[PDB]
Each structure stands twice: as C-alpha cells, then as structure tokens.
Scaffold this active site. Structure first.
Site, PDB file in Angstrom:
ATOM      1  N   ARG A 255       0.826  -1.187   0.000  1.00 53.10           N
ATOM      2  CA  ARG A 255       0.000   0.000   0.000  1.00 53.10           C
ATOM      3  C   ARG A 255       0.871   1.251   0.000  1.00 53.10           C
ATOM      4  O   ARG A 255       0.511   2.262  -0.609  1.00 53.10           O
ATOM      5  CB  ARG A 255      -0.918   0.030   1.211  1.00 53.10           C
ATOM      6  CG  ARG A 255      -1.833   1.231   1.204  1.00 53.10           C
ATOM      7  CD  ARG A 255      -2.673   1.269   2.432  1.00 53.10           C
ATOM      8  NE  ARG A 255      -3.446   2.500   2.513  1.00 53.10           N
ATOM      9  CZ  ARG A 255      -4.142   2.838   3.588  1.00 53.10           C
ATOM     10  NH1 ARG A 255      -4.135   2.030   4.638  1.00 53.10           N
ATOM     11  NH2 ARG A 255      -4.840   3.974   3.621  1.00 53.10           N
ATOM     12  N   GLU A 357      -3.234  15.356  14.036  1.00 50.96           N
ATOM     13  CA  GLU A 357      -4.368  15.118  14.908  1.00 50.96           C
ATOM     14  C   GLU A 357      -5.047  16.415  15.311  1.00 50.96           C
ATOM     15  O   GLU A 357      -6.247  16.574  15.129  1.00 50.96           O
ATOM     16  CB  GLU A 357      -3.938  14.300  16.130  1.00 50.96           C
ATOM     17  CG  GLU A 357      -3.607  12.833  15.797  1.00 50.96           C
ATOM     18  CD  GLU A 357      -4.635  12.194  14.861  1.00 50.96           C
ATOM     19  OE1 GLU A 357      -5.857  12.330  15.093  1.00 50.96           O
ATOM     20  OE2 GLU A 357      -4.222  11.554  13.883  1.00 50.96           O
ATOM     21  N   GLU A 384      -8.965  14.166   6.508  1.00 49.64           N
ATOM     22  CA  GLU A 384      -7.599  13.674   6.332  1.00 49.64           C
ATOM     23  C   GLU A 384      -6.707  14.687   5.609  1.00 49.64           C
ATOM     24  O   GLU A 384      -5.541  14.874   5.976  1.00 49.64           O
ATOM     25  CB  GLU A 384      -7.604  12.355   5.553  1.00 49.64           C
ATOM     26  CG  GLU A 384      -7.966  11.147   6.370  1.00 49.64           C
ATOM     27  CD  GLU A 384      -6.940  10.912   7.423  1.00 49.64           C
ATOM     28  OE1 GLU A 384      -7.080  11.497   8.528  1.00 49.64           O
ATOM     29  OE2 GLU A 384      -5.967  10.178   7.120  1.00 49.64           O
ATOM     30  N   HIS A 487      -9.367  -2.380   5.066  1.00 46.85           N
ATOM     31  CA  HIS A 487     -10.489  -1.631   4.491  1.00 46.85           C
ATOM     32  C   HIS A 487     -11.429  -2.428   3.612  1.00 46.85           C
ATOM     33  O   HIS A 487     -12.620  -2.107   3.532  1.00 46.85           O
ATOM     34  CB  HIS A 487      -9.945  -0.477   3.659  1.00 46.85           C
ATOM     35  CG  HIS A 487      -8.932   0.345   4.379  1.00 46.85           C
ATOM     36  ND1 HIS A 487      -9.160   1.653   4.742  1.00 46.85           N
ATOM     37  CD2 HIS A 487      -7.696   0.032   4.830  1.00 46.85           C
ATOM     38  CE1 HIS A 487      -8.101   2.115   5.381  1.00 46.85           C
ATOM     39  NE2 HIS A 487      -7.198   1.152   5.444  1.00 46.85           N
TER      40      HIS A 487
HETATM   41 ZN    ZN Z   1      -6.466  11.006  11.832  1.00 47.52          ZN
END
Ligand code: ZN
Ligand code: NDG
Ligand code: NDG
Ligand code: NDG
Ligand code: NDG
Ligand code: NDG
Ligand code: NAG
Ligand code: CL
Ligand code: CL
Ligand code: ZN
EC number: 3.4.17.23
Lengths: 597, 173, 597, 173
Positions: A255, A357, A384, A487
C-alpha cells in the site's frame, strides 16, 4: 403548516435529541478506549445501541418527509442524511445475515494468524509479527512466506463470505436507487442543486481516471528507480523490464513503499533531518509537543485548544494498571467537548502526527456552529487532507529551524531535498496507483463487470497492468487477496485516500500562495501566516453545509480536484528520476513473473 | 436580601423563571462590583448607586447567556425569557459546572423549544401541552406531536458553551 | 550584365565605402560629444561633411538604377534608401539658411540660462540647476519662476527661428512629394507592396488617435488621483475640477510625472519600491549599474558587451576639464564598435535607463549581420520599445530582489503592487497624452492648420483639453513653448515615444508568454528565460530588412499596434484608481486658470 | 627560419600574399605548440613531427580568418586566396590590433572584392585593371567601372572581428 415547516420542526427535535444520545455514546466509547474495564465494554455498547436505535427510528420517521418537495438547500441535506434506509431496506434474514458476514470478515482479519511451517509452535499475527517481517526483512523467501501465508490462510476464508457480502450489499444498493454498492459509495461525492457546483457519481470516475493519467509518468519513473534499486537488494529475483514482486514492497500489500527507503535512498551519505534525537536531547514531553502544535495553529489566526482539551485529553500511554488503545485519534464528542487520544512517544513521527491530529480538532471546532447533521468534513477526503496539510508545514527544515529543534545552521543542500522528496513519493506517490487500482476492481466487481470465475485473475491482470506489481506465487479463486487488506474485508470506501491525497496538495499550494512563499513548494511553512488560516477557516467552518466543490473553491479557487499541485510538489524529484533512469527501463511487461512457466 | 437570591441553593429552569420582588430594602451593589466570580455583568442603565427592583433567577447553557439581552434573536429569548427592547437594568451570570453539572449528566434544568408566537417582555409560559406546528390537540407517540419542554443535560466534561450558568436579571422600575 | 547585376556590384561598393566614411564620422561625433575641444568641433564637421557628400554623390548615382526594374526584395530597399534628396532638394541659400536655423536653435537650447531676478550674478542652466528645481522643489513660486523663465528666455528667442524653420522645412517636404514635413515624418511608418502588411502615412494618425481614445479613461483617473494628491502638496493653488498647473508636474514640461511619486505614493508606509536609496546605501557605482544590466541580458541568452564597450564607453560625467553632452545615448559607430555615453547618477531612474540604453546596443549588435543599409530598427519606435522592454522587467520588485536592492524577504502584498503600478503609470501613462498632444500640435502647424497668430493659443488649448494641464501665466505669440523642449528645437520627431509605448507592452505580453509566465503581465520578469531571449533576438536580428508590421507579427502576431496589453498591465491600478477617485471629480475644466484669478 | 616568417616585421596584403619556400631545414614546431598567442591553429592533417614546406603570409579582417580553410564560401577565399578542398597542413592566425591597426586608421592592407571567376587553390592575382561586370575595358570615373583593389582600414577602436589578423598557412607536400 406546509410539508417544509413540519420538516423543520422535525429536524429541530432531532438535533437536540441526537446531541444528547450521541454525547452519551462518545463519552462511552471514549471511557472504554481510555480505560478497558469490563463494566465499560457494556456501557460503550449501552449508549452505542440507544444511539443506533434512535437513528433507525429517526431515519424511518424522517422517511415520512418528501425532500423532493422542499425549497431549502440546508434542510434537504439533513433529511437525506437521515433518510438512510440503511440495512433495514433489506429483510429480517438478509439484514441479519449481512451483519453476520460483516462481523465475521472483520474478526477473521483481526484474529487470523499464520504459523511457521517448519516451526508449527510459533504463529504470528498480522500485527505485529507478520507486518514486522514485511517491513524489515531482507530475506526473499521469508518475505514470500508471510505474503503468501496470509493470503492463503485468512484470504481463502474470506472468499466465500466476500462473495455473499457482494450479493447482499448489492441488493441493498439497488433498493436505495443506486446502480450498485459502488455507485452507493461514489455517492459521498454527489451534489444536487446549486449550478456550477453540482457533481455526479459518474463524474467521480471520470475525474479520477483523467487525473490519474497525468500521474503515470511520475509514477513510472519512481517505479523504474526503485526497481533498479531493488535489483541490488534481491539480485536475480527481479527483471529490469518486469513488474515488482508484490512481497518485496515494504508492507503486507505494498500500500505504501515507505519502508523501501532504507534501500532506495538517493544519497545514504547525507545526514539528519530527523529531529527525533534533537527532541529527545531537549527533554521534550507530550505537553511540549501539543502546546507547540497549539502555538502553530494560533500563529495562523486559529484559536487555542479548549481548557477542556487539556483537562480531558490523554497524551500518553497510562501504561499498565490502566490499559488503552493507542491508535492516535482526534475526538469530537459533542457539546463542544474536544480531546485527543495518543500514546505519545518523543518521535519526529509523533511530533508531526500531533499536528495532523490537532488539525482534525481544529476542523471539528470550526464547524461546531453548523447544525448537528452538517458537523463533518466536506467529504471523506477533506478531514484527512486538512491533517496532512499540517504535517507538511511542520516537517519543513525551516519550521523545525524556527522552533529551534534544527540547528539554526544546517544548509538545506540540493541533495537532502532529494532524499526527502523520495521518502515522500515512496509513501505519497507510491500509494496512488495501488489505491486507484484497488477501488477500480472493487468498483467493477460490484457492477458485475468482473465475473466470479475471473476475480483474482483480474486482480492481477490489473496489478500488473496498472500498478507494475506481480504475485510471487499464482492465485486461482480459492484466494481473495483484496480482502486480505483491512479496508476491504471491513467494508470501507477506499478512494478517499486518492482524492484526499490530491486535495491536500491543492490546499498546501493555495496556502503557500497565500502565505506569499518563494522557495520550492515542498519547503513551505504556512506557520505565522494569518491570511493563510483565513483562506482555510473559510472552508473549515462549513463542514457538510455546502458542496465540497464550493468548500474547496474557498481555498484553492478551483471547482474540482486537481493533480497538478501534487506533481509540482515532486517536480524537483521527477527530473532527477528521469535522469537516473537514463539507461534504465521505464515501464514494465505484464507477461513476466517470478515463478514463470 | 440579595444573598438570598444569588447564593440561593437551587435555581429554576428558564421556562419557569423566578421573579423575586424587592422593596423597602437598602443595598450597596458593591457586593457585586467586587466580583471576578462573574462571567457577565452587562448593565443597560449605569453602574452607580442610590441605595433605594426585580430579581429574576434561572439557569441556561453557556452559549445561551447571549440571548439574555434586549433585541436578541431566539429560542431562549423567543420562548422562555425575553428582555424588553425597551428599558433595562443588569444581567449577571456565572459558571456553575460543579454545582449544576455532573459527570454522568444533569437533566433537571428545562427550557421550551416549541411554541406559537414569541413571548412579550417578562412574560412566562409554564404550560406543558403536546405541541403541533398547526394548532390541533395532540397525543404522542402521534407524528408531528412533540412535548414543548426539553432538558438541558449538563455534563461536567462538556465545553464552556455547554456548561450550566445561573443568571440573575435585576430590573429597576 | 543585367540591370540587377549592375546594381548589386554598386551597393557592394557603397557598403564598403559607406562603412569607412560613416565610421570616421561617428568616431568624430563621439570624440566631440565626449570631449568638446575646439579642434574636435572641426573634425566632427570634417568627416560629417565628407560623409554627407559621399551620400549625396551616391544618392544621385543610385538614382540611375531602375529599382522598379529589379526582382530582388533586398536590393530594392537599399537602393530606395539611397534614392533620397534630403536637404539638397532645396537651393544654395535655403539649405544654407535651414542649417543655420537648425544649429542656432540647437545652441540656444543647450546654452540658454536664466538668472535670478533678485540675484543677477547666479544663473542656472536647464541641466542641472533648473531641472533640479523642477524635480524636487516643493515651492510653488520657485517652480513658477523656473518654468516661466525658461519659456520666457530661451523660448521667446526660438520663436522667430521656429517660424522660419517651419517654412523652409515644409518647402523641403513638399519638394520630395509630401504634403508637409509632418507627412514626411509620419513616413517612417509607411509600407508599399506586400499585401496585408502595407501601411500608409495617414493610417498612423488614424491608429494613433483611435488607440488613444481607449487610453483616456485610465489617464483621467490617474489625473484625478494625482490632482487630489497635489492639492495636499500645494494647498489652495489647485481647483478640484480644474487642470493641473504645468509648473507642478515634476520635470520642466511635465513630459513624465515620475517625480510626482514622492507625493502621490499610494502607501508610503510600505517598503519604498524606489530603490534609489538602496543603491545609494549599498554604495552602487556606475560600473555596478552597467555590469548589472549586462548580466541581465546575458541571462536571457544574449551576449556580453564587447571588450570594446567597456574600454571605450563613458559611463560617468568627467566633470570639469573635459565637458561633454549628457543626453544618454547608445552608439553604433560601425566596424562592430559599440559604446554608451551616459553621465550616470546612482538613481533608480538611471538604473532603469542603463537597461534601456543597453537594450539599444543589444539591438545594434543583433543586426550587425545586415548589409549596412538595413542596419536599423524596424521603424523609429522599435529601438525605443526594445529599450523599454528591458526597463519593464528590471523595475519589478521581483527582479529588484534578485539584484539585492530589495530584502531577500520582502513580501509582495497587494499594496506594494499598487505602489509599483502607480509609479509605472506616472512614467508610462503620464507621457501618452503629453506625447500625442505635442505631435498633434506640430502635425497641425506643419499642415498649416494653425496660424502664427494663434500658435500658442491652440497649444495651451490642447494642453488644457487633451493633457488636462494649464499655463500658470498667460503666453502671447512672443512665446514659443513647445520649442522649450529638446526634441522640438533639435528637430526630432516625437510620436516615436507613443508608438513605442504601445509596442513596449505588446512585445512584453508575447515575451512573458514565451517565458511561461504565471499570472498578471505587470509582475513578469523575463530574465533567465533564454526562450524569451531567443524570441526577441529573432526580430532583432532582422534590422530594418523587414516591414515593421511583419516584424511585429513575428513576435506578437499582430500586423499593427494595439493598446490592449498596456491596458491589461494597468488594470489592477485602473480598478483601484476608480475607487480612490470616488470622493473626487474625475475629468477637468478647461476654463480654470491659476492666473485668471 | 620560422622566426623569419612569423616575427616578420611586416606582412603583405592578401591579394598579394607571400609564399616562402622551406627546404633543407629542421624545425621542431614546438615553437608553435607552446603558444596561447595564437587565436587560430586549425590543422587539416595532424599535430606531430617528422623533423624534415610552404609558408604563406598575409593579413585579413577578424571575421575573414574563417575563410582560410577548404570549402569556404567567398570574397577573400573567392578572389584572394583559396585553400584546396583537397590536401592541407595548418592555418595559423593571431590578433595584431596594436601593430597593423592605428586609432586614426590604417588602410595599407588591401584585398580584391571584384573579379571574373574564382581562383584555383594557391592561385594568385595581383592585376590592378579597372573592373566591369561584363568584360569591356574601363576608364573610371566611368559608370559601372570600379577598381578591384580596396583597402581594409584598421582602426584600433574597432570590433574584434574588424581588427587586423596576420595569417601564416603552412603547406606540406
Ligand atoms: Zn487522523
Ligand atoms: C435556504 C432557506 O430556505 N433559508 C432558510 C435559512 O435562512 C435558515 O438559516 C434555515 C434554518 O432552518 O432555514 C432555511 O434554510
Ligand atoms: C552576394 C550577395 O548578394 N549575398 C547573398 C549571400 O548572403 C547568400 O549566401 C546567397 C545565398 O544564395 O545569396 C547571395 O549571394
Ligand atoms: C536565390 C535568390 O535569387 N535570392 C537572392 C539572395 O540569395 C540574395 O541574398 C539577394 C541579394 O541580392 O538576391 C536574391 O534575393
Ligand atoms: C560565459 C559568460 O558570458 N560569462 C562570463 C563569466 O563566466 C566570467 O566570469 C566573466 C569574466 O569577465 O565574464 C563573463 O561575464
Ligand atoms: C532572476 C534570478 O533570480 N536569477 C537567478 C539567480 O537569482 C540565481 O542565483 C541563479 C541560480 O539558479 O539562477 C538565476 O540566474
Ligand atoms: C432556525 C435557524 O437555524 N435559522 C437561523 C435564523 O434564525 C437566522 O435569523 C438566519 C440568519 O440569517 O439563519 C439561521 O442562522
Ligand atoms: Cl494483494
Ligand atoms: Cl510648455
Ligand atoms: Zn534612447
């Protein structure tokens, strides 16, 4: 007294009721994740179900309102969110069964283990064990082992379930007036009524594929460079004109090529842009990390964290005597309650992670003014994206110098630029083809275009064709490699990672434009800029209230997702690659494989 | 006799605010001047003295305190307690998260979110009759019928704008 | 043996002979202009006559060749250029007189001085002294004095001569088959035979006036804005609705508003975009200025200056013990001998002028490959335009940063941009009307449309109506104001400065395109773009070997000049102007005067 | 005997170039190798030695030095001195701006700009007969009659390409 007015008074009751139950649910989920007591796992489900029920009951009721018969942008949105026929659109057995599958697949993946064939005593879990092999091991066969074991075990098991999962999930999709579950997912990107900002579920593929085309050249070169490098790591196992053995890519699936850095680094003689030790040498604690991140946002005109944030957050592993989950997460409990949960270690990774975050938190704050049902990022890619924006500015040697974690000296020479960009492309660019390829298969599989008798035989007809990657061992139909990836066998829309990726670069660009930034785009630090925050908060305060097309426009001036800013972030690299590839083969032949015959 | 209003152990819900009358008293107001214990004090008259009043008590969400003022938009001011655009004295408020809020939740304090027509200054509706946006009697569970009174629910780990505030509104005539 | 062949061998002889005499003439004119010795004024005339003679002798001889009987583009041009009558077309006395006039006027201008009424000892020369007053003085009266004295002195004197200059010069014109000397000048722009590329002497006026109409709105706002500002500088002396007092514009005539910058600056609190002091503070000398401009051309892919340039040029006033003319000039002596003559002062105006001058030299170099008779700019406005192209890029704050006259920091926000635009307009936009109006007056006087009894009525009529300027005191026909300026009484056409400005921006648009430029034209710096370099040189190389219309189309793709580019370059400033002028009258009244009071 | 050729105080005009014959000599050539004093050295054979020649001296314009090579277009090479497409030794030139050039003008060095037909390799025409583009005797000032010989005129302030250059052409057989 019209159907519009009865609807408004309805959503009004919803918002106030949701807020209470939702808050009870989060405070529950939180309490559990921060303190894994037995009592807690009940409470997390306690409030977890009332909340579910409420939605279900509300959804069914919200159903009795014709949004097609509504002259008000906002409300229509909220209703349609509630008009989630959900699983319920099926039947007692179908809905029961489907959840059975969902949960089973989830458990298998999380609980599946593989054991050493000539040491049956020691089995390994994907995390760590297996993952740890796929990230550090230089042994072709050991790496082969893991890769194959995992797909040959948990993979094979998920096949039957995934097959039925597709069926049951499709009936559901069509019942809600979609072509297929794919169409369903692609829905997230849709916009009805506004003109110029409208967007369709097809328009996505169109925009995705056209933008991907413009990515290939860059990727092909990245591909060629790592290929030759890999040849030196695993002499003999790789063809200079062929695809890359899927098990040699750095993680379980490839990935990300992030862990390829150790053996694809352009100039291993270069030194340290890694303040990990510089932080350590300065006796930095979790407090400093976050106070610092706060300061960062404050600098662009954004607000301090809430007194509550500091009161209720958990910024470090409590250790034993109180275990907790450690996935770094930004919490928007509701009732203006914000907090982060993160088992902070004094790593540069963690210093950046903290900014990612707190990015989310800053976003959650900005849109708190929106009606409850609009309080969320524009799309799955927005939140994101906003977080990655932050990592980007904090990562710059400039910012790190500004903070005083990087020697106020240190010449940012032409070579550390490459080392850096390559380690970025390995993660950022390396994932695009994979991510597109992944959703491309999924998508088609739900559209009937990929027959059950040609599933895995198509997975790889596309990994070879699209990703430049090959299976070290062949796979028939007893295999279900795609579900081998979280996922997938956990029911999550994946294309987010692509569109997020593209978004964040447009954002970064528009913001360094706004922050009046001269150097190459990758050295930009929006820090200390306020017209930057402004240009951002202008879209941060909307959440789901408008169409992303507008929200995005509020920052970039564009009505759509654009590849070019992303390519611009890797322009200095792109050229270097082409040069390095001077006598190397760029591209691959689908027909070669490491087992042949 | 103000200590009996402000330090009162318990306060009412806005939908049922309490008007205490004060006549034939002498107070200095200075027991109020000297107070960083107050997150709000916006008067609408002055800040002097004459040693001579209507004190109204209630509790609201932090972000609601903004509506206890002349002109103000709606919901709390619309359906519960509406000051007059006209005359005015003072509006005092203070955070009571450790008094009126609990970690597990405190839903004793109520407010009205549905009604027909706004309230006139100092009016008080304590009716509790199932609501329908178009006259008509009701009988919940019936659809489009809701109970007009609703609980705040003050959690002690909530945001500042979501914490309970006791408010006293002095009125000089 | 054909007539074309007899001709070829003729021009061949011409070129070789012309080169020798012409060279000797230039080396003579130069030696004079840089060292005004007595002996020198002879020799300048010496070679100057031998050269005149040679041309006159070669002219009559060239006549004997039928160019109509020639099937070769090149030669036809050369011949026709030789097929000229010049002054000779007149008589012994006329031609003698004309030159007496030409030389007298030219001497009165250069030699005139005004003496302080209440100080008959000290007198001032137009340059410096007088010019210094007009560029810095904030005193209404001191400026009134200068302006008036100069026109009262040298002006009155030239009136007689200018009147006769017009007569003899008109006869001359008509004798060569022209309507008037005006027609003569307008000739430079003519083109016969090519189809689509032909251009007539009358087309100029038409195109000039048509293109000017579209400049008015911009000029009227610039005018309104500076007017208001000036009212603050000279409280009480200016009508809010009336024209601008001619003695207050920043130089002797108001040819340029460049010196109005100091008191019309949009945001004085910004970091001054007039790097004059920066240069001064950094100790910049003439060498640095010129060596700096060379570096600039080299960066677009043009050649260094010739070793000769540096050895032979004169880049500063020798002072006393060697007086010299100080008009900045770029010499193409011949035999690849190039030099600039400039009394360089460390000013920003001079720094830009250096680029402009050195532009001419670059053009001269680029076309040295052309047969002697083709060695020249396409038309009289090409050279000036090429020089101004350079000033454009070198003036930008971006370039200024690159040079290091502006802090490597310096954030280009939208106020610095207005400042930069306002100042560019002061120079560029401000001269457009002054130039059109001047040439018109002349053209008219040439066509005879203006009687000697109103010569100065119609002047101040047009100075009021077209430029929006007004004489501070009344001038009868004793006065001759236009001749109060160099170009008028030194027998130079003026429209070159208008046509020039338009090409300027056209060329710039096309060049910045060739240089793959990001956004607004005003923020473009072609330096470092060998592509834009190449492009320019390609129409430079051509010389006068081409009709200007074709040559213009080679670089910008337009057969003729257009005003759009100029207007786009100024747009931001246009829109900002309209807003500032919301509390002021925009336009003027011809009826107001500072003396009719 | 080379110093006699190169260090010759005076060189001829191209139209009348000087050919010196060198036989029964021994020269190292190194007195040519060790020279940045030479702006040209194009040889059309080698760069070694056999310690064994035809030296050709003359002067030309900077930009004309390019015609002293085989193939070459015209004017100097066409009407004054044409090397053979065929065989070849070395061609050497050096700038002499301070020797053959004077600030006031130096027109001693001539060249032929008119002629009938090109020269063959090493041919040499020194005739000075009034030229006409079609046979026919001439009598200047008569029209279409020009003198073939013309002077260079070397100024000391000219361009590099207009400065004088002495040129020696060595030929081996
Ligand atoms: Zn996050
Ligand atoms: C677009 C429209 O219908 N206007 C109103 C809007 O002003 C108001 O904020 C909202 C809240 O219920 O209701 C409607 O959306
Ligand atoms: C002598 C003359 O007129 N010059 C040109 C010359 O520049 C060019 O090389 C040639 C090409 O055919 O044509 C002519 O000969
Ligand atoms: C092929 C041809 O006839 N063209 C020539 C051209 O080469 C030369 O430069 C010019 C000079 O007279 O004459 C003609 O244009
Ligand atoms: C190649 C070129 O044109 N640039 C040179 C530069 O490199 C050199 O250092 C300098 C010395 O005078 O002259 C020129 O500027
Ligand atoms: C206009 C401009 O910035 N020119 C730059 C110069 O600043 C820089 O030092 C050099 C190094 O890449 O390239 C160009 O010459
Ligand atoms: C019930 C609701 O949410 N609507 C409000 C409305 O009261 C306000 O006046 C208007 C602002 O223009 O829009 C919304 O913010
Ligand atoms: Cl896979
Ligand atoms: Cl004047
Ligand atoms: Zn000039």
């Amino acid at each position: 007294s019209t159907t519009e007015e009865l609807a408004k008074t309805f959503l009004e009751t919803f918002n106030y009721e949701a807020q209470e139950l939702s808050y009870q649910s989060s405070v529950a989920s939180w309490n559990y994740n921060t303190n894994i007591t037995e009592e807690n796992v009940q409470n997390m489900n306690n409030a977890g179900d009332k909340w579910s029920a409420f939605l279900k009951e509300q959804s069914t009721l919200a159903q009795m309102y014709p949004l097609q018969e509504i002259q008000n942008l906002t409300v229509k949105l909220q209703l349609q969110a509630l008009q989630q026929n959900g699983s319920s659109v099926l039947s007692e057995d179908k809905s029961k069964r489907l959840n059975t599958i969902l949960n089973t697949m989830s458990t298998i993946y999380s609980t599946g283990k593989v054991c050493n064939p000539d040491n049956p005593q020691e089995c390994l879990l994907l995390e760590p064990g297996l993952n740890e092999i796929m990230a550090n091991s230089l042994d072709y066969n050991e790496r082969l082992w893991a890769w194959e074991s995992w797909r040959s075990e948990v993979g094979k098991q998920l096949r039957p379930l995934y097959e039925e999962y597709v069926v049951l999930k499709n009936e559901m999709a069509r019942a809600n007036h979609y072509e297929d579950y794919g169409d369903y997912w692609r829905g997230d990107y849709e916009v009805n009524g506004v003109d110029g900002y409208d967007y369709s579920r097809g328009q996505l593929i169109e925009d995705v594929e056209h933008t991907f085309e413009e990515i290939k050249p860059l990727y092909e070169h990245l591909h060629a460079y790592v290929r030759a490098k890999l040849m030196n790591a695993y002499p003999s196992y790789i063809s200079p004109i062929g695809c890359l053995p899927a098990h040699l890519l750095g993680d379980m699936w490839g990935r990300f090529w992030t862990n390829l850095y150790s053996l694809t680094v352009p100039f291993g003689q270069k030194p340290n842009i890694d303040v990990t030790d510089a932080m350590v040498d300065q006796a930095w604690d979790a407090q400093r990390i976050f106070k610092e991140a706060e300061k960062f946002f404050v600098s662009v005109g954004l607000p301090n964290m809430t007194q509550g944030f500091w009161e209720n957050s958990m910024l470090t592993d409590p250790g034993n005597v109180q275990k907790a989950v450690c996935h770094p997460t930004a919490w928007d409990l509701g009732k203006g309650d914000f907090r982060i949960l993160m088992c902070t270690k004094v790593t540069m990774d963690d210093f950046l992670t903290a900014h990612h975050e707190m990015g989310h938190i800053q976003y959650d704050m900005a849109y708190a003014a929106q009606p409850f049902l609009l309080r969320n990022g524009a799309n799955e890619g927005f939140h994101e994206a906003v977080g990655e924006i932050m990592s980007l500015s904090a990562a710059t040697p400039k910012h790190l110098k500004s903070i005083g974690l990087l020697s106020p000296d240190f010449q940012e020479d032409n070579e550390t630029e490459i080392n850096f960009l390559l380690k970025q492309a390995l993660t950022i660019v390396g994932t695009l083809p994979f991510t597109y390829m992944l959703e491309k298969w999924r998508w088609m599989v739900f559209k009937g275009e990929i027959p059950k008798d040609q599933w895995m035989k198509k997975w790889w007809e596309m990994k070879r064709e699209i990703v430049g990657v090959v299976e070290p061992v062949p796979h028939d139909e007893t295999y279900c490699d795609p579900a081998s990836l979280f996922h997938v066998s956990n029911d999550y829309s994946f294309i987010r990672y692509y569109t997020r990726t593209l978004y964040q670069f447009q954002f970064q660009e528009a913001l360094c434009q706004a922050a009046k930034h001269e150097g190459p785009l990758h050295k930009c630090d929006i820090s200390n800029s306020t017209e930057a925050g402004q240009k951002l908060f202008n879209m941060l305060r909307l959440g789901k209230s408008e169409p992303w097309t507008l929200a995005l426009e509020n920052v970039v001036g564009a009505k759509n997702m654009n590849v070019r800013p992303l390519l611009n972030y890797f322009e200095p690299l792109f050229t270097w690659l082409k040069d390095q590839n001077k006598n190397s083969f760029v591209g691959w032949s689908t027909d070669w494989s490491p087992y042949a015959d | 006799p103000f200590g009996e209003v402000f330090n009162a152990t318990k306060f009412p819900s806005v939908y049922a605010w309490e008007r205490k009358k004060i006549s034939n008293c002498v107070a200095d107001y200075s027991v109020l001047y000297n107070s960083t214990f107050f997150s709000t004090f916006k008067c609408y008259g002055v800040s002097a003295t004459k040693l001579n009043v209507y004190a109204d008590s209630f509790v609201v969400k932090g972000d609601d305190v903004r509506q206890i003022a002349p002109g103000q938009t709606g919901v709390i001011a619309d359906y519960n307690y509406k000051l007059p655009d006209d005359f005015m004295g003072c509006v005092l408020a203070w955070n009571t998260r450790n008094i009126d809020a609990t970690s597990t939740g405190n839903y004793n304090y109520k407010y009205r979110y549905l009604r027909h027509g706004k309230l006139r200054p100092f009016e008080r509706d304590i009716s509790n009759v199932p609501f329908s946006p178009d006259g008509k009697p009701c009988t919940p569970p019936a659809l489009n019928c809701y109970w007009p009174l609703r609980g705040y629910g003050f959690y002690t780990t909530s945001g500042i704008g979501y914490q309970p505030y006791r408010v006293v509104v002095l009125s000089f005539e």
